[PDB]
Write a protein that holds these residues in place. Structure first.
Motif, PDB file in Angstrom:
ATOM      1  N   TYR A  46      -0.105  19.219  -4.438  1.00 22.26           N
ATOM      2  CA  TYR A  46      -0.867  18.923  -3.229  1.00 22.26           C
ATOM      3  C   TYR A  46      -0.339  19.826  -2.113  1.00 22.26           C
ATOM      4  O   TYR A  46       0.697  20.480  -2.274  1.00 22.26           O
ATOM      5  CB  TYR A  46      -0.583  17.488  -2.801  1.00 22.26           C
ATOM      6  N   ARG A  89      -8.185  12.375   0.051  1.00 17.80           N
ATOM      7  CA  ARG A  89      -7.156  13.322  -0.368  1.00 17.80           C
ATOM      8  C   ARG A  89      -7.798  14.605  -0.874  1.00 17.80           C
ATOM      9  O   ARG A  89      -7.206  15.682  -0.772  1.00 17.80           O
ATOM     10  CB  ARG A  89      -6.274  12.739  -1.487  1.00 17.80           C
ATOM     11  N   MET A 147      -4.661  16.736  -0.237  1.00 25.21           N
ATOM     12  CA  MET A 147      -3.601  16.268   0.644  1.00 25.21           C
ATOM     13  C   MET A 147      -3.263  14.824   0.263  1.00 25.21           C
ATOM     14  O   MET A 147      -4.070  13.927   0.521  1.00 25.21           O
ATOM     15  CB  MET A 147      -4.120  16.342   2.101  1.00 25.21           C
ATOM     16  N   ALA A 148      -2.074  14.594  -0.302  1.00 24.00           N
ATOM     17  CA  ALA A 148      -1.735  13.282  -0.855  1.00 24.00           C
ATOM     18  C   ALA A 148      -1.594  12.220   0.233  1.00 24.00           C
ATOM     19  O   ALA A 148      -2.071  11.099   0.068  1.00 24.00           O
ATOM     20  CB  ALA A 148      -0.450  13.372  -1.661  1.00 24.00           C
ATOM     21  N   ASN A 149      -0.955  12.568   1.367  1.00 19.46           N
ATOM     22  CA  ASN A 149      -0.478  11.525   2.250  1.00 19.46           C
ATOM     23  C   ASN A 149      -1.316  11.413   3.528  1.00 19.46           C
ATOM     24  O   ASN A 149      -1.071  10.490   4.323  1.00 19.46           O
ATOM     25  CB  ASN A 149       1.016  11.713   2.530  1.00 19.46           C
ATOM     26  N   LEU A 150      -2.325  12.269   3.693  1.00 17.49           N
ATOM     27  CA  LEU A 150      -3.329  12.116   4.761  1.00 17.49           C
ATOM     28  C   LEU A 150      -2.718  12.135   6.169  1.00 17.49           C
ATOM     29  O   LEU A 150      -3.228  11.486   7.088  1.00 17.49           O
ATOM     30  CB  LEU A 150      -4.144  10.821   4.634  1.00 17.49           C
ATOM     31  N   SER A 180      -4.285   4.576   5.962  1.00 24.05           N
ATOM     32  CA  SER A 180      -3.193   5.297   5.320  1.00 24.05           C
ATOM     33  C   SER A 180      -3.619   5.633   3.901  1.00 24.05           C
ATOM     34  O   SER A 180      -4.603   5.047   3.380  1.00 24.05           O
ATOM     35  CB  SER A 180      -1.915   4.453   5.259  1.00 24.05           C
ATOM     36  N   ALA A 181      -2.925   6.610   3.294  1.00 22.95           N
ATOM     37  CA  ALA A 181      -3.310   7.047   1.960  1.00 22.95           C
ATOM     38  C   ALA A 181      -3.198   5.908   0.946  1.00 22.95           C
ATOM     39  O   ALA A 181      -3.960   5.854  -0.024  1.00 22.95           O
ATOM     40  CB  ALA A 181      -2.427   8.203   1.526  1.00 22.95           C
ATOM     41  N   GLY A 182      -2.233   5.005   1.160  1.00 23.73           N
ATOM     42  CA  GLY A 182      -1.975   3.915   0.226  1.00 23.73           C
ATOM     43  C   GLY A 182      -3.114   2.903   0.169  1.00 23.73           C
ATOM     44  O   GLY A 182      -3.180   2.109  -0.768  1.00 23.73           O
ATOM     45  N   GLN A 183      -4.028   2.940   1.152  1.00 21.64           N
ATOM     46  CA  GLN A 183      -5.180   2.068   1.161  1.00 21.64           C
ATOM     47  C   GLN A 183      -6.336   2.651   0.321  1.00 21.64           C
ATOM     48  O   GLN A 183      -7.363   1.982   0.122  1.00 21.64           O
ATOM     49  CB  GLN A 183      -5.614   2.099   2.634  1.00 21.64           C
ATOM     50  N   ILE A 184      -6.198   3.877  -0.216  1.00 24.42           N
ATOM     51  CA  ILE A 184      -7.354   4.499  -0.855  1.00 24.42           C
ATOM     52  C   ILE A 184      -7.631   3.778  -2.168  1.00 24.42           C
ATOM     53  O   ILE A 184      -6.712   3.549  -2.962  1.00 24.42           O
ATOM     54  CB  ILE A 184      -7.081   5.996  -1.119  1.00 24.42           C
ATOM     55  N   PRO A 185      -8.898   3.462  -2.519  1.00 23.95           N
ATOM     56  CA  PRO A 185     -10.075   3.795  -1.709  1.00 23.95           C
ATOM     57  C   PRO A 185     -10.522   2.662  -0.799  1.00 23.95           C
ATOM     58  O   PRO A 185     -10.333   1.470  -1.081  1.00 23.95           O
ATOM     59  CB  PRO A 185     -11.119   3.969  -2.851  1.00 23.95           C
ATOM     60  N   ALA A 245       2.983   7.050  -2.037  1.00 23.72           N
ATOM     61  CA  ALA A 245       1.800   6.318  -2.444  1.00 23.72           C
ATOM     62  C   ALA A 245       0.605   7.231  -2.671  1.00 23.72           C
ATOM     63  O   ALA A 245      -0.260   6.965  -3.537  1.00 23.72           O
ATOM     64  CB  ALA A 245       1.502   5.248  -1.416  1.00 23.72           C
ATOM     65  N   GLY A 246       0.511   8.289  -1.845  1.00 23.76           N
ATOM     66  CA  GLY A 246      -0.639   9.181  -1.935  1.00 23.76           C
ATOM     67  C   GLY A 246      -0.709   9.971  -3.247  1.00 23.76           C
ATOM     68  O   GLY A 246      -1.735  10.559  -3.581  1.00 23.76           O
ATOM     69  N   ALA A 305       0.817  -1.211   0.000  1.00 25.71           N
ATOM     70  CA  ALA A 305       0.000   0.000   0.000  1.00 25.71           C
ATOM     71  C   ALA A 305       0.857   1.270   0.000  1.00 25.71           C
ATOM     72  O   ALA A 305       0.551   2.243  -0.688  1.00 25.71           O
ATOM     73  CB  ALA A 305      -0.937   0.000   1.187  1.00 25.71           C
ATOM     74  N   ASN A 306       1.923   1.284   0.839  1.00 28.74           N
ATOM     75  CA  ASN A 306       2.502   2.572   1.158  1.00 28.74           C
ATOM     76  C   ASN A 306       3.859   2.789   0.511  1.00 28.74           C
ATOM     77  O   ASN A 306       4.468   3.833   0.724  1.00 28.74           O
ATOM     78  CB  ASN A 306       2.470   2.827   2.667  1.00 28.74           C
ATOM     79  N   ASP A 314       0.893  18.871   0.570  1.00 30.61           N
ATOM     80  CA  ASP A 314       1.985  18.191   1.276  1.00 30.61           C
ATOM     81  C   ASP A 314       2.985  17.537   0.316  1.00 30.61           C
ATOM     82  O   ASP A 314       3.888  16.842   0.767  1.00 30.61           O
ATOM     83  CB  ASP A 314       1.414  17.080   2.168  1.00 30.61           C
TER      84      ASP A 314
END
Ligand code: 6MJ
Ligand code: 6MJ
Lengths: 763, 761
Positions: free
Chosen positions: A607, B161, B500-503, B580-585, A585-586, A505-506, A609
């Motif tokens: 973004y 995000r 916000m990318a990384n939450l 975490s952001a990597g779990q989206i959605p 990841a975001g 995920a990350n 951040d």
């Protein structure tokens, strides 16, 4: 003799004759399969007693007679010849089997070369080399009696969370399609009786699952589906005449691909003219019931899959045996079974199996292709960053640190036999361990090169144990340079960090590897970071703390030598990223061919951040030399909608080392009737340049190559301007210009060109 | 008098008569707009000199005469009356203007109550309270001469995000649709001459941009588009008779929504029967050229938007003036202009503007609706975690720490006037001063506390940590109040354009929480935020967590009432909180193959389950569910089932429970959600009180799209799951649809009816 047995008759006649002679039970049997391991005794010899039950009415395919039995090549060949002889001599009609194996990174069985992973193949940007590779795999496969390889993967990957990123050719439909056609052409050759059926997979969309999660929904709208996901398969079908397609496990917007007639028949067969066989992904028919919950029993799953257009249920008959009952009960027409059987029999005739289904066991010894593997490894490694530390001098004392510096198992990808088969994990454990011994280590390569070094493991790939850090920091402090080698363990089990079923995920480097790099950097010693990984990882926290970074996609058996060659400058790195590296990841997804509104947040750009730009862009890859681009020509300046432009650029190696450059052509379009990518890869050429050598690279770009789907879902070339951008990455554009299409909008119908032709000529 | 002037004639007759009398220039002017601020002098008074140029041929709308001029309500009313008088008395035909304002969280101008943000409205699960709120907004708006409010947002949000998450009703098409219909009904009322036109936005898909990035492509396939994104708009059009729609700035799969006739006409008008006006998002026509690069000049942008079905270009005429040239040059037919003008004039007649376009300035004083705001704030706060620390005793010494404890500005959402306008200095500062702080509410409740700011919302300065740690060590409990600053500018962390990318909580606020927790003192974490944040790193380190979606002016009182148990928290999440952001959605209505990675279930590094699921929300009391009834057990494909459950408050404090109905289906001809919200009811229960909650579920409500894109109800079994969240299911059962597959054609029911009745003695 019966017409079907007569090689002087045309294949259509032999197919019709044979089909007319078959019972319903024999027809249904040709749509199924049996595992190699189900046909052997405990010593790996063909078991007639097991065959009498499983093969009595014939069979469509044998699944992995080599890959599932842990037999050496000659024993696998002997097993296949015995299977064939049982079918030819002890069934009523004598129809031979087709044999398949995995072969993505070479035949996946004992004795076959482990070539670098697919994402490394793409990073070469060298389609001819990949064709050379699969021409060698073809010969390995045919030696053991295998007729079909389940490769290549043409899934387009823009989500590096997904564990199967390493098996793809990356994010670009153009590069995926072009590498895919070369891959297929090498495996199949011109006459398939002398070649191996390629199987493009996983049709289609499988690399875009929700959240990057394996088998999760792939919810893609129509224009993106056609232009990104389908496009490489379309090229493989139409330009490379690929003879098999495997479906995707995922649903698209409510419809599992194994139950989707609009996809596996209407697009693939009707619109594109595919004439080969569709094979299921393993258990994909059964899990229409068990996983997607749209079939109430195995017979309904069978009906959905056959109506969708799956011809062969793999890897063992399970639901397709109920097709007999469905016909007898008047639920489906036998004509629909005949249509599938016709496709399977045609291909068996084309493969020459009714003339000669046997191989010479004495010739079944597979040759090493370490030479080709090393060429791919040497061309696939990417120099992502270099402040000048590389190449290293041989007299520098090295602290070699990290789990991937020491452990040969971690050089292997998820479809390399000695990694893949571990998913089954005492006789097998010992056989793997023995075979592992023969693969060279990164350590071995450093020792062979004569470098003075000390090795500290530093940490494991996974877990949180930091007890090895002190030893690593201590050897760093007494060295000239620290080379920290970190990354993945690839495979299908829980202990693996990438591979099928291992989604991340990350995007942090696994374990405490990131912390290891940062602790080493704190020594103040120069640091070369070597990533031996199957996916992009977030390097946001290390990039500015290390002096150079090499990306080494899972390189298989040639990895150690290529890495050391590059570090010391015996080879000048020349790989280019085939997928963007996100900052985090975001940020997912990041890719080079965003629309004007993509790849940014409006109206502040970034973004809150994080930048919206990847850390390293598509096409990125540095060199130990410098290339200078000049003299962009674009002729003619105005072309009609089915015309051709010729784009030329001169490239000169102005530095001090020989090196290959991958010259990239990006095309942009504005003021179409739909939005278009600001830039998208549409051609490329790897060019070798000695120091101070100049050459001209020529791209011949037919307007067919630029076609896109309009508001009404028609494939068009519309008049207007196309931007030409030529450079060393998708960001490192060196020269730009434009040409215009003039005349009435063109609907592009029927066959059309997919690729730019790329050549070199004297400057 | 001309027919159009005669109120005894039917509106269609007046429209036809007026249209027949207009020149092309007058027609095109009805499709455009002017900013309120363009019509005032330096003293904030109507400027006849400016009007002579801008209004000479009439005008479709005035944009934000209150919101863009910083006028108080009575001055805004006076300005609007003078604009209308100029139109009525000094233009050839005397067509009045329609006035729009923002009003998502209340009229967005000086003098208007700041209600909690939309995501807080949804967290109440109380559609009737939202209707009560917009009925009050309606009165505020009509007082100042405003006829149309640009709300509600019906974008369905599954990507936190995105900086506009706070303006949505969350992830569930059912909840968003149900809250949206109540919102619209309150604003519009039955006869629009006495109400305010609601504007559902942003049609459609705008909350599913690539990477959560504002205006980026929203690439959604058809069944998902119809079932998730279009559904709430469909309900607003067909059930709530909404009279305006605004388009999305994004493209769907290569087609900008502002240039998409298949969306703004074929779906909205042809398929659904919408009869109102489509207004552009601001500058959405112009940026067909500037941003999407599909229009070569302003006149092409105008043609694309008019053909798509945009009736009014907002916020100022820019491209639509060239429609006159396009007709004169024979590029477009005047009939197409006439069609748009007809829609605008019809609505102006229906609003009563040709009979009376003026308001009484003496009555233009907007009343405070702090009472309704406080009811929403008290019902919207969600108790995400509580190990038993809450409710606090009033004798405990509190260390009140964090940027959002002290700064009133950070209570405000992105469409609250005193936040939004930050994108006259004395007027803002003065008005800010009148809103109560979290600090103020602690003082009023009589708590002994010390305050340490701890850190800013943004940046990396940790020099305030020591003071916060020191007051924590001297207190009994640390109440750490962290979160966002919402708005449109770079200093903001959430709001339109702030993605916000990384939450991670902004700045070093997460480190602030962790440093305070290291003292060993109990910690109550209060999130005053516009979006879900990743709480993975703090959840196990704090004793309780309250989510306070940007609560506006009633925030401080509601938070302190909940902390001390004067109010029993009853909010429930309307959107999943990712780990975490990597779990989206992450969302509750995944298909069987969604919400997991096959075949190990989780990611290598992360669970596939959200940290807090949809519908989650704790209480200071306990609710016991019993006696599930489902009748009848077999229903035909257009029948109705009645599901009842008893709920008893078995604890010691009165409280509201939000009882939730989830429906699951397998063995349909397409994959379906394992569970999806299909009904709900907020029920008040005194301690030891028991009531029955009744859901009347028509099969129409369960319709979905099949392989051939037909809306159907198929025979088979449906699973019924009733409980206190999407995970906290308390009772389960099933019923069967029996008979032939049904195509659901024409009008159908959208909602489960939810009621309470007496439980058996
Ligand atoms: C179990 O996983 C499947 O096994 C067979 C392979 O060919 C497919 O790629 C893979 O998805
Ligand atoms: C500039 O942003 C636009 O301004 C008008 C608002 O109503 C819309 O929500 C918003 O997208």
């Amino acid at each position: 003799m019966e017409l079907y047995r007569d090689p002087s008759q045309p294949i259509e006649v032999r197919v019709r004759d044979l089909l007319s002679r078959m019972t319903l039970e024999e027809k249904v049997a040709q749509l199924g399969s049996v595992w190699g391991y189900e046909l052997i005794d405990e010593r790996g010899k063909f078991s007639r007693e097991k065959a009498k039950e499983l093969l009595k009415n014939g069979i469509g395919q044998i699944t992995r007679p080599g890959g599932s039995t842990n037999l050496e090549p000659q024993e696998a060949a002997e097993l296949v010849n015995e299977i064939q002889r049982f079918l030819v001599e002890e069934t009523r009609l004598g129809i031979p089997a087709m044999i398949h194996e995995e072969c993505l990174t070479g035949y996946m069985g004992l004795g076959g070369t482990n070539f670098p992973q697919a994402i490394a193949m793409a990073s070469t940007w060298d389609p001819d080399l990949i064709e050379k590779m699969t021409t060698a795999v073809r010969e390995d496969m045919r030696k053991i009696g295998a007729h079909q390889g389940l490769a290549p993967v043409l899934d387009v990957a823009r989500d590096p969370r997904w564990g199967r990123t390493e098996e793809t050719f990356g994010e670009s439909p153009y590069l995926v399609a072009r590498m895919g056609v070369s891959y297929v052409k090498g495996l199949q050759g011109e006459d398939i009786k002398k070649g191996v059926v390629a199987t493009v997979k996983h049709f289609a969309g499988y690399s875009a699952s929700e959240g990057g999660k394996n088998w999760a929904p792939t919810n893609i709208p129509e224009r993106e589906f056609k232009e990104v996901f389908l496009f490489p398969f379309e090229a493989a079908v139409k330009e490379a005449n690929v003879l098999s397609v495997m479906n995707s496990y995922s649903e698209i917007d409510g419809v599992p691909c194994a139950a989707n007639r609009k996809l596996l028949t209407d697009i693939l067969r009707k619109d594109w003219g595919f004439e080969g066989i569709v094979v299921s992904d393993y258990f994909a028919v059964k899990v229409l019931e068990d996983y997607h919950r749209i079939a109430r029993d195995k017979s309904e799953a069978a009906r959905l899959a056959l109506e969708a257009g799956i011809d062969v249920e793999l890897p063992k008959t399970e639901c397709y045996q109920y097709l007999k009952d469905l016909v007898e009960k008047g639920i489906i027409s036998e004509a629909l079974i005949d249509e599938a059987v016709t496709r399977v029999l045609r291909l068996k005739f084309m493969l020459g199996l009714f003339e000669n289904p046997y191989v010479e066991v004495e010739k079944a010894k597979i040759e090493s292709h370490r030479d080709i593997a090393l060429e791919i490894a040497r061309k696939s490694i990417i120099l992502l960053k270099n402040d000048g530390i590389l190449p290293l001098q041989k007299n520098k004392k090295v602290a070699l640190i990290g789990p991937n510096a020491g452990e040969v198992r971690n050089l292997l990808g998820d479809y390399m036999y000695l990694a893949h088969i571990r998913a089954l994990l005492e006789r097998l454990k010992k056989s793997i361990e023995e075979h592992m011994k023969s693969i060279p280590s990164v350590l071995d390569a450093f020792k062979e090169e004569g470098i003075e070094f000390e090795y500290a493991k530093g940490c494991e790939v996974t877990g949180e144990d930091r007890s090895g850090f002190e030893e690593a920091i201590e050897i760093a402090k007494k060295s000239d340079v620290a080379i920290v080698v970190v990354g993945d363990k690839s495979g299908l089990t829980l202990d693996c960090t990438t591979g099928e079923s291992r989604d991340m995920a990350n995007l942090k480097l696994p374990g405490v590897q990131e912390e290891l790099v940062l602790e080493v950097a704190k020594t103040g010693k120069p640091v070369v970071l070597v990533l031996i990984t199957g996916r992009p990882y977030s390097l946001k926290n290390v990039v500015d703390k290390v002096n150079a970074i090499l990306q080494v996609w899972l390189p298989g058996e040639a990895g150690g030598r290529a890495i050391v060659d590059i570090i010391y400058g015996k080879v000048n790195p020349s790989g280019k990223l085939p997928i963007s590296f996100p900052r985090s990841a975001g940020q997912i997804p990041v890719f080079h061919y965003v629309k004007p509104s993509g790849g940014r947040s409006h109206w502040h750009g970034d973004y809150v951040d994080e930048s919206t730009k990847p850390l390293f862009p598509f096409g990125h890859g540095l060199s130990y030399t410098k290339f200078e681009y000049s003299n962009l020509r674009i002729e003619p300046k105005e072309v009609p909608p089915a015309g051709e432009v010729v784009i030329k650029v001169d490239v000169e190696n102005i530095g001090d080392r020989d090196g290959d450059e991958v010259v990239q052509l990006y095309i942009g379009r504005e003021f179409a009737s739909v939005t278009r990518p600001v830039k998208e890869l549409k051609g490329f050429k790897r060019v070798s340049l000695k120091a101070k050598e100049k050459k001209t690279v020529v791209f011949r770009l037919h307007m067919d190559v630029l076609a896109y789907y309009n508001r009404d879902m028609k494939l068009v070339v519309e008049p207007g301007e196309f931007k030409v951008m030529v450079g060393s990455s998708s960001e490192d554009i060196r020269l730009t210009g434009s040409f215009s299409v003039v005349g009435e909008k063109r609907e592009v119908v029927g066959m059309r060109k997919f690729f730019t032709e790329a050549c070199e000529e004297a400057a």
